[PDB]
Design a protein around this ligand. Sequence first.
Ligand code: 6F2
Length: 253
Amino acid sequence: QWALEDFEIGRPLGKGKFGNVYLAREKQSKFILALKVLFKAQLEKAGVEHQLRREVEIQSHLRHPNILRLYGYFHDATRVYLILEYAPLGTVYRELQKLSKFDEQRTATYITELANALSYCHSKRVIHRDIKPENLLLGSAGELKIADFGWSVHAGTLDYLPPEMIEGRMHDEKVDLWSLGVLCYEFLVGKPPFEANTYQETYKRISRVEFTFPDFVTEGARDLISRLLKHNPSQRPMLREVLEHPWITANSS
Ligand SMILES: Cc1nn(C)cc1-c1nc2c(-c3cnn(Cc4cccc(C(=O)N5CCN(C)CC5)c4)c3)c(Cl)cnc2[nH]1
């Protein structure tokens, strides 16, 4: 049973369409954490109380070192507050816009941590679906941490969604293997494989699987990425096969 007077709000960690994320500390234990604030009124206009209750339900008792812990929740009359873990080193997003590109060691390392987190999620019949750099945070040691679970369920922005999911078809655990491939590409190139200027256009890119490699992208990476980005959901590797991929094993930590 929590309240809003239990916390001292501080620096804004970022703003979102659902609401803003603020740094906060619990008064009694002096515990530092992230406090996401969402307005109940703007939540009704979107009608996603099922996904917020599902995101809370799913991310609650999910315990993994590469997954952002959801400690608890509460609410006043006006809004709805979520009590999350705090990621000291921030997001991978800003990390990416600062370095522009990632080296193969950082990329392969992130992919590994992400596969461990995904392999843990998949063993519980939980699909993240919405895997993107904006939902990737960093721990005190710089480890990866998957945060948002708004679109998470059991078995918009198109850049990371797979062919089957965008065409309205039936999607399974393999939608994350595609996302995992899209993220790997962006880490090495700095932009998504199917990036465009219009929604209508990116849709064609994804559905036809039209992507090309810049020169500086080695063969090891071109192989892993091409395997993950198959139109056929069954043609994609397992999380086991990904982890034990030559390029991953060679450059990961
Ligand atoms: C930031 C930050 N800096 N440092 C040192 C730490 C953080 C930090 N953030 C979180 C978050 C968190 C999840 N989503 N957000 C808001 C958000 C989402 C996506 C991107 C940004 C961001 O960094 N932006 C800066 C650049 N502009 C352009 C675009 C926005 C912000 C914050 C959570 Cl849930 C938990 N712990 C955190 N720690």
